[PDB]
Amino acid sequence: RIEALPTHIKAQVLAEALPWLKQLHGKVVVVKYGGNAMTDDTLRRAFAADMAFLRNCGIHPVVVHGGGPQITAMLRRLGIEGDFKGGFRVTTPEVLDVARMVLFGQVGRELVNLINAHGPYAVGITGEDAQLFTAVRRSVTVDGVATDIGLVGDVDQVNTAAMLDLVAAGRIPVVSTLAPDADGVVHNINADTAAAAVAEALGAEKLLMLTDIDGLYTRWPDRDSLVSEIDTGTLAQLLPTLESGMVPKVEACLRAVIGGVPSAHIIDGRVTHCVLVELFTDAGTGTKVVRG
Amino acid sequence: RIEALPTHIKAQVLAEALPWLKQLHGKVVVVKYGGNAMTDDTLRRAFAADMAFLRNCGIHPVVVHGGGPQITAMLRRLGIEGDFKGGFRVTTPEVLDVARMVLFGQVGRELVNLINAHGPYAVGITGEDAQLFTAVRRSVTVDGVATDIGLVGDVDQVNTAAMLDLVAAGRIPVVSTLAPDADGVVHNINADTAAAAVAEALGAEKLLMLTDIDGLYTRWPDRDSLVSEIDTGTLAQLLPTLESGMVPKVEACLRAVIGGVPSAHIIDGRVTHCVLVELFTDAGTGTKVVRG
Amino acid sequence: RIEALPTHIKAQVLAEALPWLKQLHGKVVVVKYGGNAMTDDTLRRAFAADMAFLRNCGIHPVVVHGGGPQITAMLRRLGIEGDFKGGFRVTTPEVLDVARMVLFGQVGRELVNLINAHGPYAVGITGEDAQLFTAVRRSVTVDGVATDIGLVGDVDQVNTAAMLDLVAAGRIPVVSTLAPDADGVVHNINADTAAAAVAEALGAEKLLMLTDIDGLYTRWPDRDSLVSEIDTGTLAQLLPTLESGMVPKVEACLRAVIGGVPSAHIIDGRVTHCVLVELFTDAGTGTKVVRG
Amino acid sequence: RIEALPTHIKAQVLAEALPWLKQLHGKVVVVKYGGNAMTDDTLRRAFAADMAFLRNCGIHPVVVHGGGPQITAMLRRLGIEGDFKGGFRVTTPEVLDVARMVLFGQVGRELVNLINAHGPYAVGITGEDAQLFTAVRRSVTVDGVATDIGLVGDVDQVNTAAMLDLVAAGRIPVVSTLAPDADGVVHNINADTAAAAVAEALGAEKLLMLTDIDGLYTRWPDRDSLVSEIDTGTLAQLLPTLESGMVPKVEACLRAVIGGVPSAHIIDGRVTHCVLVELFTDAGTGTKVVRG
Amino acid sequence: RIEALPTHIKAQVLAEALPWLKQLHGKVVVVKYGGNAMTDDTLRRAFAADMAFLRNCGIHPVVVHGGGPQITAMLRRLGIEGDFKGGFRVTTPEVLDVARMVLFGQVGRELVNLINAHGPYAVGITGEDAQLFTAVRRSVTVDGVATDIGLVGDVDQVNTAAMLDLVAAGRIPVVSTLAPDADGVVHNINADTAAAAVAEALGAEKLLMLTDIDGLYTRWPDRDSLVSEIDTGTLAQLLPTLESGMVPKVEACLRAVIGGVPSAHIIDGRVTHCVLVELFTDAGTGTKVVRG
Amino acid sequence: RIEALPTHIKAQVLAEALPWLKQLHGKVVVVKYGGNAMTDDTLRRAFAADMAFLRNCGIHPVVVHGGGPQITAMLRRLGIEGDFKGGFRVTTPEVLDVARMVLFGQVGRELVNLINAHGPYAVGITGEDAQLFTAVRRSVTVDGVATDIGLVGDVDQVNTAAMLDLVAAGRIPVVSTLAPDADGVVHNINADTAAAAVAEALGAEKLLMLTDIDGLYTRWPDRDSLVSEIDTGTLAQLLPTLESGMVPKVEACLRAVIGGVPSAHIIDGRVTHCVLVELFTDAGTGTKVVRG
């Protein structure tokens, strides 16, 4: 029902992209890709087409993906019983091997192949490859005490130079968030915190975080709570109040934007081509976070 | 009235651009710019924004402009009485100096400045600069006899290499169609034939020719005559029948597409952002000419 | 017991490497890595140190790995019952996903990490990444009739240029042999045939094929059958007689050396640092195949 | 009468050029070109040959030209009556358009074509092209009060990098002194002040200012007043005493040499090949200004 | 007595250099340097200044030097008695060592140091260094029988690429004519034949051969015999008639010009700055040889 | 008797080279070459093969050579009687010419030719060529008074950049230690002090100094005095006690290692392939000097 669209309306949608093309040309955009945007075929195919879009505009997308539920599925099919502290599964060496094998050997593969239907762009990588980035073991807090939950950590250091060589070669890196610690022992890294760490280290112009909601509600569930733009100051003050589902997506945006990334975006991964809408439209389809 | 546009319609307009972004990324597009698209301020400002659009997509636009009516105006303000053979003004050395001074020193200037509101892109050039291209004197036919009408000719040879150096540097060349002959004497070149010559020599992916009409009508004025796509074979057979206004715009498309340019486009310069519409929409806003 | 080695013997071992350093400097060496050389920790750690050796000589190693037994293990742990035609497991879409996930997400990972203890060298890749190479479905012969056994094939075409860009950047590619067909459907490729295909396409100076035996015996099990050098002519004539374990390793050497690779080597992966011995010693530790 | 020149005299003239070739090789020389050196055909043809000379020595000439009298002529032929404050014509938007069209579209054109008889060297440019330099509106002083005289100003900022890219490509820039202000409105810039501004910004080794006199007389009209070398200190003290014709040519030399340009030269544009004489002869044909 | 030279005469000498600067810019000139031009201090210092001149014009000089008499002197001071067949000294391994040590270690050194007073330009080389060129043993004819006279030969092959790398780096190669044969045994090469061989292999624009005479006399000693220009056809026919001193200098010019070198020049090394005179003056100071 | 070497011993010798290959890959090694390592043919041929070894590992060797005894021999064959102050021969301009001619024109030549049997690597150079380094006249102390002994000095400044261009081009520089002072007058430089000066200026990873002894004895002639590793602190304190033969070799190591060179090595030039042994074996064959 878009043949029926008069040509002067198509003209104005295209033209409205100009200031965003100009702000992003030759710049890197880190895209955290997860949620339904990763399970419905229409949404995924469109997300892949959009990484190609950016690349065919001379924009440099970097995709960081998660895959928590597919790990648990494979761990269940292998009969690997988990140990849990608080709400956390302990990542034994056995669980890491499965997580790595699932993230890198299955979930990364499907994205690379989708993107590569448009051309020779996607390349899968972890922190292990060429020592592109390292991890540092992180503990969590259960009942306000810090606790070890196995081979889990945060991005420690990033080989910024070698990373930017990959995208100057015209490649879209699909990053599975696994990385060696300083002793060579590979950890699993939360894909949200990692996308923010990669955004900051690569000097990204934008960090996009796909989620399964319209945007951020300041006082959920009040419908009026929805905000389209917000700065780090007010947002950090709202943080110890939001739903548990958005605390990590917000902490990532805070860390990124304060880390120098001009804007981070919490966008609706249920919207087809949500990437194109947030980047090339003034209104967008999510919450834009800036510093202030 | 485009805030009112639902976000999923904006999504589909943007997404439909993908296969054209991919076909044009890193490619040169020669755009012949004339007609009303050059006299109404809204249209011109939009045409300038569109050259910047292409450039901010990693596309390489080259603008060839005419300016026949502004020359006649200046010739009238200078009281330079013309001599006419057939319907042709003889281009004396005096008329060339005015034509060059008007084309290069006024009409080219306004475009360069418009485009350059978006950034350091436009550079004005003639065939004289760096010997970028030469001319060869052409005669016309009045009553079926070939006749001399002064310092007028066709593009003879083009410095393809130096031309492509200019656009690899990220510059949009605004070409005033004046060029030296083999003896150094500068001629004026019809901007339509020149755009086709520059398209062919630069290996352009598309030649766009802005005119003041919807597209080509095969049996004007029959409304049903309008065609959106047509090949060189059928088109060359329609040529000794169309209106006098479109014979040059068609001959250029023939010469270009047969010269290897994959497609030439006769598009409506009265449509705002007509460049964006023909390039990034499947339907377009003109007639597409291919070989066949 | 090598402190006890007199310094003039260490001198002569080192010096004897000179003509091989000279023949290989700046050249690519494809190394097919499998067998025990991939299951005993001492052998694997030494194999990793040797890829670093080559790289620290300005030699360009490319590692192609298999992993048949680890796939069958994982298929067993997942309870995926196989279908068999002849001695062949049918590779359903389900088996491919496991094979890819095991080859790329586990077996490739361990090598990359081993090599990367020496520095930022190893990068895992499949034919899917950047469309580095494609596959073409192959059938097998059961009882002399050609038979379909699922998503299995041969290397079809190789992106030679992009491959050599990777190693000019100083990277050691660890190749998991999975590749998309012309329709995008990923197949599993026998690592032996693939190493020979990659050798030929990259213009490799040598193809090394690690196996679990001293070398090739012409009339096994006669101890006198062992040959240290042999040409394609005599070897192709010996082929329909050897043990079933060596027919693929020999066919690969034939295809490579006839494909222009100056020499292919069937070397003993049970010998620690077997790579260093075959490359930098005149005698070697395997069978050298040349054309003749 | 130069066949009659003995070969050992030709030898010594050539040899005396050596220390100046060495001081200028690979260096930029800004040449302000005006006066009779621009109206007599022998002088102009020789000036063009000399820009080619420099370029065929690996020297990088940059030509800044004026053209005040040709503007007034065209303004008279168009019947554009001027408004005058003091001795200054007000530069209305109409006068700017004529000035730009004359400077860029006629006077620049003739030089480019002359130079280009020797090869593909000359390219005409203004501050508008690629935003190569901007202007800032300047007022003048009539009777010691500062007064607005329209769209006239000084060079504000220069795109040093893009300028030096042009001459590293082997091109001789012919600069028409028109430039946009910070709002995009194009002004006309006095060619003398502009040549000094371009000299300083490009790190020029020398600024040559062609005039219609032997050199600078310190107490004109005393014949003994002529000086061949002088420093900024003494010269700035002589400035509020010289003829009105030389105050701008001197202020330019002061601004340049104090701006870091090692020497500025006021040379006689009535001398054929005056450029060659001042640059490659110890004596020169003008006044050399240094710092002190 | 050149202060007394009016400035308009200095102008015309300089200007007359233009077409030769243009023909030689970026081109290599092989200069065979010998005779008195190598023994009188004024002449040598001027010859060195002239190599710097060429280099400071973006011209690429290559100097090939001889030194026959200084070898005989050193052989006499060492008491090495010679053996002679015909008029030829047999070049024993002992004589080669002296010749190499004199040519490379003394005569080359003085030139390099002279040239390098003007800057970091000269570098001494033989065919031994980087295998820049090889030799092939040549026999001579005594009484019409070909005879061995030791380690003497002709330039066999030249590393054109590595040679042109040296001059693109901005270096003036001072070539001592010694080169290894295919077995590594170094021979001495006649500097005249070698300069012609280096001219041909480097694609030189000109070969200059300094001698101790005005130019070539066709029927010496007739004063009218002197010719300023001559082609290979007529010259080869004059060859079995000239003085013994010029047969090698002519054979070199023939071999070079027929080898594709546009012109070879036999110029008077007794004229100060003879290089500058022949290159940058229309008349020259020698005989110019062209093909015809 | 090295065929008899079991393959697993050859394996371990090769493998033990890995950490040294890694520490030296892409790094420059200055090698001072003198003593018997320069007079016995087996040792010299092996030393040449070893420079090729380094180069075929992507290591950048730079050879500094002496040749004191061959100078005295030639001075004797020429009957040039010397003048002596203390134990020092005065270097008259005559002696310099012989020294330069011997060092550069004979001793350098033989090494270049030896090395070049392995490929196009060696190039002979002095400080005179391209002004690669200068000298400063040095006086010596006879009976504790500083005394002039002619044209002798120390390396003053080094053209680090142009030097490293030579080795990035893949060339092994054979350096004859002669260099011009600031006035252009060439001096002879002690090859030991020069190797240390070149090591420091090029940022060398190691300086190797070949001598005619096992290593450094701290209290010669006590056999127990031999040390395999020692730091600058203890070594400088041992210096005013060692044999006269090693004071210069030690002072060079001190100056180098304190100059930032990570380690200097005094190795036994009587050991065949002593370079390979000290570099690629943990034990070495000399004394390693580090800072401490």
Ligand SMILES: N=C(N)NOCC[C@H](N)C(=O)O
């Ligand atoms: N307000 C929100 N959440 N989005 O609108 C901003 C989108 C704009 N294209 C940008 O990239 O900044």
Ligand SMILES: N=C(N)NOCC[C@H](N)C(=O)O
């Ligand atoms: N049918 C016409 N006239 N235009 O539609 C084709 C437009 C398409 N973007 C192209 O560039 O080919």
Ligand SMILES: N=C(N)NOCC[C@H](N)C(=O)O
């Ligand atoms: N004969 C056998 N199988 N090996 O010896 C040859 C090894 C040699 N380094 C080579 O790389 O050719």
Ligand SMILES: N=C(N)NOCC[C@H](N)C(=O)O
């Ligand atoms: N004295 C005067 N005015 N000129 O002589 C100096 C000219 C010299 N070639 C230079 O470029 O400095």
Ligand SMILES: N=C(N)NOCC[C@H](N)C(=O)O
């Ligand atoms: N006629 C003789 N011998 N010389 O005059 C020619 C010189 C000219 N510069 C050239 O380089 O060709």
Ligand SMILES: N=C(N)NOCC[C@H](N)C(=O)O
């Ligand atoms: N101890 C001595 N003298 N040598 O052993 C050290 C050698 C080691 N390859 C190095 O290059 O440091």
